[model samples]
Target: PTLQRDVAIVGAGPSGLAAATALRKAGLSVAVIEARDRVGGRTWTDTIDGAVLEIGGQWVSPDQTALISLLDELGLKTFERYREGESVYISSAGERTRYTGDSFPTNETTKKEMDRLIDEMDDLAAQIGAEEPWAHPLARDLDTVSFKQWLINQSDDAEARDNIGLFIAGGMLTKPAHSFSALQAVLMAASAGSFSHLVDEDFILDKRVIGGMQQVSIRMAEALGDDVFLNAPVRTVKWNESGATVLADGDIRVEASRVILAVPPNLYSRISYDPPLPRRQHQMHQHQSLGLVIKVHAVYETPFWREDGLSGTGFGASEVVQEVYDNTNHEDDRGTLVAFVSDEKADAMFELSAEERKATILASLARYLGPKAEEPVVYYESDWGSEEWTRGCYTASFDLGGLHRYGADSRTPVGPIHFSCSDIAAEGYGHVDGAVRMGQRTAADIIARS
Candidate 1:
């Protein structure tokens, strides 16, 4: 049998649940349809071998006001990420160094160049803004050139460029420097409030939601109850100026006045639209793409790295493990180290057989931690690349010149339809906080119009 509601939300993720909660608060009927049997799109927590593992997006920033507010309202608690002793840094030549502050201890001149670029980035981000980056005066000029090229144009210092570019390209976007535009990088920095925040782990990757990050959506789904449906992947959306008919895979139907596509931008073309989206939307969706990354987790019998006066945090621009951090659970005896293999490195690792991948990754970890890293009680890799639903991790971004050409209309409603996802948010773009913000923004807009 078909279901009917005033509002229909696809993807029972943070965005969908946020929309449902807001709509319910306004006393409007809401239906949340999910492809997976459970809630939370990219954020999923798993208990692997008696250990809690966050397989998806989990980090929380201090400036994420929307998420912070939601956590307060939901009564959910957060814990600081375990960053204790000296952090390690590896150079392209495999030389390791320990430092207290950010960076691998660059030379004075290189550090100066890096600081200068950070100032330039902050200035450019302020000018670009986040609300409507495509509307900026320098949008086209900045968007047309690749970030790597723009960095080259600004400074001749290679080390300085790579260091700064790593924050936006490899760290935030998960895409390489050459893949995205300077405008896109500027938007990421602006969305987070500043480029400095993105560089500071204490600011950007500050804390983690207690229990697990996925629990945020799970709790929302519980509050939503039967209003949210699972395993109902939307196959088609038949819409007109009046309303829309959303049909899922199993002959499930949700007829509603307005529909919100709360999934990632990369999955937009997955659903069939009866009359087809406008030419602009069709073209806009095509330009937005997802970046790939392998989030590797290794659990030990004890907090071995801490015993060695290591914070369990490490960074290497040239290493397969671009970044590493202590991910041990609260009061847990066992130690867990988390690392990321992004972009080209991820591709190289994925090409190997499962066993080879495991050995190679562990060996890389051994270089960071001693021979102790070679063996782990539990080893898991959060491979979002093979997932048909997500396809990748983190979030999506636009190509060169695509943001200016398509980002303005990327989130606009198409007649009886609307968009709600972290990917398109202005304030907290490409993060869970952004997803909740987009949900709130879209719901408020729909409520006001309705």
Candidate 2:
């Protein structure tokens, strides 16, 4: 059947759902189409063997105002991460070191240098307003240089570079050599409010809905009523100066005054456009990278590491996992450890069978905890890259000098179609807060124009 709405939103992730809610609240006829069987996009929680495991996004800090606001509005609550004892840091060669602080820099001198570098970076972030840092002069200039180059210029110390490289890779979800810019790095540090917050604590408070993050999406969908559509993948979008006709599967079509393409850059090609995107947009679509972090969870019969006086979280693993954490706060006695494997290492890790992957992790744990690292009751992993609906985990650093040229401008309206994705948000890209804010702002823009 044919349908019509004043506004059409493609992809029902945080951005798309937020847009649908905002447009509906503004009294506009809106429709949201998502390719996934369910909403929440990248935010997902799975229950395995009586344990709640986050297969997708897992962190939300108190400072993330938008996400906090949304959660409060939805009556959601979050918990602080487990930080019982000293954290364990293991080297690639199986050496273990302990630190009393919540976090330890890759090296000591790097820690001191990072403190100084963060001061400068914080000052830069303060200069760029939360709305659009890329528009700032310093941020614009910094975007011109790669993050690695910027770090090199900022600090002559090799330790600083290595430490900063790990940070840049993990935080930006891209490598320093390819994805980071000196200015953007500083700007990001500044926007985050402090380097201490970035290095220490990181404010990675874990959140699980009363039910799940999916409940947040379900609430938003219920609020929007008929505006939300499930199993509707936007197949083609024909847009002109006036309006757009969005066609999903079958002969279904929806005519709208404006269209918001909230899908990731990689998935942008899934939908055919009338006149085709501009060259720069096409280039971004073709090249915008996705972070290669694969999240793996292991549920143990008991808190084995606790027997040896160790926190479940482990950093700097061998080849596959770079970081591991205890996610068993909710359950009693049982232990759940979540591991994050990134970059090319993550790719190789995912290629192994589940048994092989488990064995690899157990071996690493055995090296650290001796006999206690035997096996887990349940083990699962999620390779965001391999998922068909989601080609990548989240956004990655574009090629060098790409952020200034396209990061902010990419969100601008093109013809009757506007763009908004968490990855392209002016703030907090690759995070749920950015996705929500982008959706709200884009919906507001479309309403104002309408």
Candidate 3:
């Protein structure tokens, strides 16, 4: 059987939802199909022991105008992230340190160098605007080099490199030596906004949606007016200069004037193309791999850490859990502490059994938070890498220079089939704001061509 619509959107994540919403607003017939059973792809919130817990992407900044405006339109409010107290830092030598003052070792000469580098990168980003950073001269040159190499070139001191490495790896999965350096990092920060806006106070936007990020997708589907489909996975897409036929669910085919392949890069090969994708697109899909990210949530009966006036945010962990934060601000005094493990740690943790994984996480927490950490009421863990529909978390840049050469080109339209996803955003590439922006932009492009 052949179903038909003016626009058939694959993947019901943030990007697909944005495209559907925009097409509907334009009075075009659209159908959104997702491989997963649920709507929110990477932005998922689960309820554990009566408390709402986010297992995926959690933070959104005020600079994400699309997300903020969407929340406002949906009459949703966000809780400010919990940051009233000091943070805890555990060094590699198993020593714990607490600091509340602005004077840290890296705040001296290293910070000055970082600030200077940021200024130079900002000047370069200004020339490119928010359109395409890789297309700019400075960005093009910087993109050719590894991030760690750039950092080493800027500062010969190993101590300074380690300091800046910790700062960059705070939220990311890769270390500075193995990751993109001060150049790519500064370009990303500037494209999003200012350096302060990307990391400091302004960066703290909404902690969690009033209900959940999934609610946003539900609202979008409602606004889309019965044009959305669930359990529909595209099997093949036969597209040409005029129209296209999308075979989904193995046999259900949908004919449309234009199609949007909004699925993740990992699943791009699943859909068999009639004439096969171009060499660059195939290479981009092959190299554009997602990061391995795991989220572990531990719920305690009370806020034990608050007694010591701690903010519950910890960095520089020795084991699988590298970053931990207090997630109890939205809920009651359940004292939910969520830890994120990415890259190598995430891969190793995800390979463990459920029970073994929980035990390992508890032991790691005990090492950092003393014996009381072992007495959590419940511990839950999720590995995005294990998810068949997702395969991995959002895309991360590689040191081999594949992102600059093929990342943007993958988003370009191929015949009558268009592409849209968070991985190809101009700014905020791995964020929800980028997903929405890319989706809307793709939809607009298709509509204009129509």
Candidate 4:
């Protein structure tokens, strides 16, 4: 049945749910349409073999004020991630080394070089605010150069350069260093307040919600009641200057004066517009794309690494998994180790057979956790890349110099339709906080216009 509401919000992730809640509070009729059978878009939790896993986005940082505020208002609680003892670092060719300090263990010369690069990055991040990175005077020059080339030019130490790049490259963007430009890297650092936070696993990967991050959206859905619709993937959105008619695949439709397209930037082109989007939007969106990643979770019988004098935190720029962390449950007895295989590494895993991929991932972790990793009670890979609605993990970023021309206009509304997502947010980019703030901004805009 076709329904009429003051505003229509698409993609019932945290952003869509947040928008729906705000609009309803203002005494406006709202409808939240979701494509998937479930509510949380990219933030979801599931259990296998009695082991709980966060299938999608799960980390919360201290720098994310919006998400923190939302969690507080909702009376939701979060717990600190496990981080105690020495971290293991393996080098190329699989050389295991353990250390307790913040910086990696390297030669004196390379260590100094790494420090210089970080100081330079911190300065750049300080100059470029997350809101509009392109507005910076150096945006064009920095965006013109790929991060790999930029770092290579800065230093002749290839190992040190790539290792430092690993923080933002494989660890954050889930893309190779050569893919994104220097300016895009600065924006990511600035969004988190500094480049150092990205390096500090204790800060960036700080906490996780008690029940699950998706509970934030689930609770919002409960409050919204019938206003939120599931299995309603909007395929066609017919809009003009005055209003919009958004239609799901079947049996669901919404007519509203304004619509909030709260999906990812890459998903913008999936829905057909009544009249084609302007040349700028049509051309600009093509420049935006998602990053690939595989979040690997292995549930062991116990916290074996801790017994071996390991923190379960591991890093190696050249390994299939550039990073690994202790992701055990709050009060559960079983231990869970979460590792990431990004970009090229993720591509390689997909090419292999199931057994081969599982074997390869385990062997990679064995270097840190010993033979115990080989025998896990449960094993699973959070392959967001395989997901239909979201074809990638972490989030999306500009290709080369695309940011210079379109970065400032990322959130620009198209007539009665507005866009918002963590991918296009200022602070907390590629995180839950960004998604929440984006939702509030879009809701406030629609509320004002209405």
**What is the C-alpha local distance difference test score of each model?**
0.89, 0.70, 0.70, 0.89
Query: Compared with the true structure, what per-residue lDDT tens digits does model 4 show for residues 255-324?
Result: 9999999898889988999898999999999999888888999998898888878889999888887899
Error of 2 at 238 (Å): 1.1
For model 4, what is the alpha-carbon lDDT of residue 227? 85
Give one digit per residue, the lDDT tens place, for model 1 in 1-450. Answer: 598899999998899899999999999998899999889989999988877999998989988999999988998999999777898877667788888886557778878998999999999888888898889888889999999999999999888888887788879889999999999999999999989888877788889998889989999999988888888889999999999999997788999999999999989999999999989888889988889889999999997998989988877777888888889887889999998898988999999998999898888888888889989999999978788889987889987888988888888899999999999999899999999999999999998998
TM-score for each of the candidates: 0.98, 0.90, 0.90, 0.98
Model 2, 1-450: lDDT tens per residue?
578889888988888888888887888888888777788888777676677777777677656788778888977776666767667766534567876665453566656786677666666667665456667777666777777777778888765565555555655464434466775565455444545456554364444445556666767877776667778888899889889999997566889899988877667888889889788778766657677776777777887777767766566624356566677745457777777666766666667887786787667655545555557787777767777777667564455666666667667788888887877765566678778888999999988877
Off by over 4 Å in 4: none
Give candidate 3's error at residue 41 in angstroms: 1.0
Model 4, total clashes: 0
The residue pairs that clash in candidate 4, if any, are: none
Cα TM-score of candidate 2: 0.90
| 18-86 per-residue lDDT for model 3 (tens digits) | 998888888888888878767878888877676677776767787788888878987878887777777
Candidate no. 3 TM-score: 0.90
Model 1 CA lDDT for position 320: 86
